[PDB]
Amino acid sequence: LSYRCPCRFFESHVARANVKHLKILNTPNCALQIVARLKNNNRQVCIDPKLKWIQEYLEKALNK
């Protein structure tokens, strides 16, 4: 129950503009660690870590 990795399924086609924030879960046992909190509906969804915009969004946040 509380032992299952939190992200069982992911969303593939979430857009940067519709994200309040990304949560990056500290779950190294687990395949999927990226969660989006969505602007339109306030849902939290797990997202595809290969989504191209994610890498740029996080790089930006690192103020490099």
mmCIF file with all atom_site columns, C-alpha atoms in Angstrom:
data_model
loop_
_atom_site.group_PDB
_atom_site.id
_atom_site.type_symbol
_atom_site.label_atom_id
_atom_site.label_alt_id
_atom_site.label_comp_id
_atom_site.label_asym_id
_atom_site.label_entity_id
_atom_site.label_seq_id
_atom_site.pdbx_PDB_ins_code
_atom_site.Cartn_x
_atom_site.Cartn_y
_atom_site.Cartn_z
_atom_site.occupancy
_atom_site.B_iso_or_equiv
_atom_site.pdbx_formal_charge
_atom_site.auth_seq_id
_atom_site.auth_comp_id
_atom_site.auth_asym_id
_atom_site.auth_atom_id
_atom_site.pdbx_PDB_model_num
ATOM 1  C CA . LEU A 1 1  ? 0.000  0.000  0.000   1.00 0.00 ? 1  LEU A CA 1
ATOM 2  C CA . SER A 1 2  ? 2.320  2.870  1.292   1.00 0.00 ? 2  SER A CA 1
ATOM 3  C CA . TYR A 1 3  ? 5.185  0.745  -0.069  1.00 0.00 ? 3  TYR A CA 1
ATOM 4  C CA . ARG A 1 4  ? 4.233  1.250  -3.791  1.00 0.00 ? 4  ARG A CA 1
ATOM 5  C CA . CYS A 1 5  ? 6.209  3.804  -5.844  1.00 0.00 ? 5  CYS A CA 1
ATOM 6  C CA . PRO A 1 6  ? 3.987  6.949  -5.920  1.00 0.00 ? 6  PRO A CA 1
ATOM 7  C CA . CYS A 1 7  ? 3.991  7.308  -9.673  1.00 0.00 ? 7  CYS A CA 1
ATOM 8  C CA . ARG A 1 8  ? 2.318  4.283  -11.352 1.00 0.00 ? 8  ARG A CA 1
ATOM 9  C CA . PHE A 1 9  ? 1.388  6.050  -14.601 1.00 0.00 ? 9  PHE A CA 1
ATOM 10 C CA . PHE A 1 10 ? 2.489  9.153  -16.380 1.00 0.00 ? 10 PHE A CA 1
ATOM 11 C CA . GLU A 1 11 ? 1.115  11.844 -18.616 1.00 0.00 ? 11 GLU A CA 1
ATOM 12 C CA . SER A 1 12 ? 2.921  12.399 -21.829 1.00 0.00 ? 12 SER A CA 1
ATOM 13 C CA . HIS A 1 13 ? 1.702  15.689 -23.244 1.00 0.00 ? 13 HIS A CA 1
ATOM 14 C CA . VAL A 1 14 ? 1.572  18.350 -20.388 1.00 0.00 ? 14 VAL A CA 1
ATOM 15 C CA . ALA A 1 15 ? 2.521  21.815 -21.423 1.00 0.00 ? 15 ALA A CA 1
ATOM 16 C CA . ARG A 1 16 ? 4.853  24.162 -19.587 1.00 0.00 ? 16 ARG A CA 1
ATOM 17 C CA . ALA A 1 17 ? 2.173  26.839 -19.562 1.00 0.00 ? 17 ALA A CA 1
ATOM 18 C CA . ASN A 1 18 ? -0.230 24.675 -17.749 1.00 0.00 ? 18 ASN A CA 1
ATOM 19 C CA . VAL A 1 19 ? 2.195  23.886 -14.818 1.00 0.00 ? 19 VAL A CA 1
ATOM 20 C CA . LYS A 1 20 ? 2.050  25.661 -11.419 1.00 0.00 ? 20 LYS A CA 1
ATOM 21 C CA . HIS A 1 21 ? 5.206  23.879 -10.402 1.00 0.00 ? 21 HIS A CA 1
ATOM 22 C CA . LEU A 1 22 ? 7.165  20.607 -10.845 1.00 0.00 ? 22 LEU A CA 1
ATOM 23 C CA . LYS A 1 23 ? 7.744  18.380 -7.812  1.00 0.00 ? 23 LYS A CA 1
ATOM 24 C CA . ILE A 1 24 ? 10.809 16.137 -8.073  1.00 0.00 ? 24 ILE A CA 1
ATOM 25 C CA . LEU A 1 25 ? 10.338 13.335 -5.596  1.00 0.00 ? 25 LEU A CA 1
ATOM 26 C CA . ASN A 1 26 ? 13.273 12.002 -3.655  1.00 0.00 ? 26 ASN A CA 1
ATOM 27 C CA . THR A 1 27 ? 12.519 8.368  -4.730  1.00 0.00 ? 27 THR A CA 1
ATOM 28 C CA . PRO A 1 28 ? 15.634 6.861  -6.138  1.00 0.00 ? 28 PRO A CA 1
ATOM 29 C CA . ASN A 1 29 ? 14.037 3.286  -5.886  1.00 0.00 ? 29 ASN A CA 1
ATOM 30 C CA . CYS A 1 30 ? 11.433 4.424  -8.334  1.00 0.00 ? 30 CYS A CA 1
ATOM 31 C CA . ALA A 1 31 ? 11.337 5.026  -12.164 1.00 0.00 ? 31 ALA A CA 1
ATOM 32 C CA . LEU A 1 32 ? 9.310  8.107  -12.207 1.00 0.00 ? 32 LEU A CA 1
ATOM 33 C CA . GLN A 1 33 ? 10.048 11.097 -9.963  1.00 0.00 ? 33 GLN A CA 1
ATOM 34 C CA . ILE A 1 34 ? 8.498  14.106 -11.753 1.00 0.00 ? 34 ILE A CA 1
ATOM 35 C CA . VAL A 1 35 ? 5.101  15.441 -10.734 1.00 0.00 ? 35 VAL A CA 1
ATOM 36 C CA . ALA A 1 36 ? 3.245  18.457 -12.213 1.00 0.00 ? 36 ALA A CA 1
ATOM 37 C CA . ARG A 1 37 ? 0.773  20.487 -10.362 1.00 0.00 ? 37 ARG A CA 1
ATOM 38 C CA . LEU A 1 38 ? -1.573 21.744 -13.038 1.00 0.00 ? 38 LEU A CA 1
ATOM 39 C CA . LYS A 1 39 ? -2.828 25.321 -13.395 1.00 0.00 ? 39 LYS A CA 1
ATOM 40 C CA . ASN A 1 40 ? -6.357 24.757 -14.896 1.00 0.00 ? 40 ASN A CA 1
ATOM 41 C CA . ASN A 1 41 ? -7.507 22.070 -12.426 1.00 0.00 ? 41 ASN A CA 1
ATOM 42 C CA . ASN A 1 42 ? -4.966 21.939 -9.519  1.00 0.00 ? 42 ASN A CA 1
ATOM 43 C CA . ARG A 1 43 ? -4.434 18.172 -10.204 1.00 0.00 ? 43 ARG A CA 1
ATOM 44 C CA . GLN A 1 44 ? -1.100 16.575 -9.484  1.00 0.00 ? 44 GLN A CA 1
ATOM 45 C CA . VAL A 1 45 ? 0.008  14.295 -12.280 1.00 0.00 ? 45 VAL A CA 1
ATOM 46 C CA . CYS A 1 46 ? 3.091  12.335 -12.938 1.00 0.00 ? 46 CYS A CA 1
ATOM 47 C CA . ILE A 1 47 ? 4.792  13.326 -16.139 1.00 0.00 ? 47 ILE A CA 1
ATOM 48 C CA . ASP A 1 48 ? 7.040  11.893 -18.714 1.00 0.00 ? 48 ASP A CA 1
ATOM 49 C CA . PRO A 1 49 ? 10.598 12.752 -17.762 1.00 0.00 ? 49 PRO A CA 1
ATOM 50 C CA . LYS A 1 50 ? 11.532 12.861 -21.480 1.00 0.00 ? 50 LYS A CA 1
ATOM 51 C CA . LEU A 1 51 ? 9.224  15.798 -22.199 1.00 0.00 ? 51 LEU A CA 1
ATOM 52 C CA . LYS A 1 52 ? 11.555 18.151 -23.924 1.00 0.00 ? 52 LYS A CA 1
ATOM 53 C CA . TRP A 1 53 ? 10.549 21.336 -22.118 1.00 0.00 ? 53 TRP A CA 1
ATOM 54 C CA . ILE A 1 54 ? 11.374 19.905 -18.646 1.00 0.00 ? 54 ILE A CA 1
ATOM 55 C CA . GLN A 1 55 ? 15.071 19.974 -19.053 1.00 0.00 ? 55 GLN A CA 1
ATOM 56 C CA . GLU A 1 56 ? 15.077 23.655 -20.084 1.00 0.00 ? 56 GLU A CA 1
ATOM 57 C CA . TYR A 1 57 ? 12.699 24.594 -17.305 1.00 0.00 ? 57 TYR A CA 1
ATOM 58 C CA . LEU A 1 58 ? 14.883 23.001 -14.646 1.00 0.00 ? 58 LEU A CA 1
ATOM 59 C CA . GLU A 1 59 ? 18.131 24.376 -16.170 1.00 0.00 ? 59 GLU A CA 1
ATOM 60 C CA . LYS A 1 60 ? 16.641 27.831 -15.948 1.00 0.00 ? 60 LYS A CA 1
ATOM 61 C CA . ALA A 1 61 ? 15.813 27.346 -12.277 1.00 0.00 ? 61 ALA A CA 1
ATOM 62 C CA . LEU A 1 62 ? 19.406 26.649 -11.561 1.00 0.00 ? 62 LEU A CA 1
ATOM 63 C CA . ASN A 1 63 ? 20.273 30.382 -12.353 1.00 0.00 ? 63 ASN A CA 1
ATOM 64 C CA . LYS A 1 64 ? 23.494 29.334 -14.207 1.00 0.00 ? 64 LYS A CA 1
#
